[PDB]
């Protein structure tokens, strides 16, 4: 929560095409999504956190309370169920859709925000810096 509020800009990506191929995203969608260089805006108002991502591909926004299940439809049109929790100062997100599952973890490292995306052993790392 307060370590994260602010505005952030993507600075590097590693293995995002292979992670997206594992999640099941189609050729054309992986191509235009892998070119995007997003800006993430995170805020807290009492009990509620909001994460907004703004991009040349799609703009996205989710609002939630920690530990409580919600519906989300992702930038690539998968309709899923998610839960977000804090573990040792990291936010962990689990997305579930028809027998599948992924985890997206966000933690601070120095002045950076690090996001690790995992689907069956394939891991992708994206690093953001304060804009």
UniProtKB/Swiss-Prot annotation:
GO annotation, biological process: brown fat cell differentiation; cellular response to lithium ion; cellular response to tumor necrosis factor; cholesterol homeostasis; long-chain fatty acid transport; negative regulation of DNA-templated transcription; positive regulation of cold-induced thermogenesis; positive regulation of inflammatory response
GO molecular function, one term: long-chain fatty acid binding
Subcellular location: Cytoplasm; Nucleus
Effect caused by changing residue 66 to A: Abolishes export from nucleus
GO cellular component, one term: cytoplasm
Entry text on domains: Forms a beta-barrel structure that accommodates the hydrophobic ligand in its interior.
Subunit details: Monomer. Homodimer. Interacts with PPARG.
Annotated family: Belongs to the calycin superfamily. Fatty-acid binding protein (FABP) family.
General function of this protein: Lipid transport protein in adipocytes. Binds both long chain fatty acids and retinoic acid. Delivers long-chain fatty acids and retinoic acid to their cognate receptors in the nucleus.
Stated name of the protein: Fatty acid-binding protein, adipocyte
């Amino acid at each position: 929560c307060d370590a994260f509020v602010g505005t952030w800009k993507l600075v590097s990506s590693e293995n995002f095409d292979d992670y997206m191929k594992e999640v099941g995203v189609g050729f054309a969608t992986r191509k235009v999504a892998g070119m995007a260089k997003p800006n993430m805006i995170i805020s807290v108002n009492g009990d509620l956190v909001t994460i907004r991502s703004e991009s040349t591909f799609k703009n996205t926004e989710i609002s939630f309370k920690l530990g409580v299940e919600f519906d989300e439809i992702t930038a690539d049109d998968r309709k899923v169920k998610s839960i977000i929790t804090l573990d040792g100062g990291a936010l962990v997100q689990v997305q579930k859709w028809d027998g599948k599952s992924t985890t997206i973890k966000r933690k601070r490292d120095g002045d950076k925000l690090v996001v690790e995306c995992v689907m069956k052993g394939v891991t992708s790392t994206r690093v953001y810096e304060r804009a």
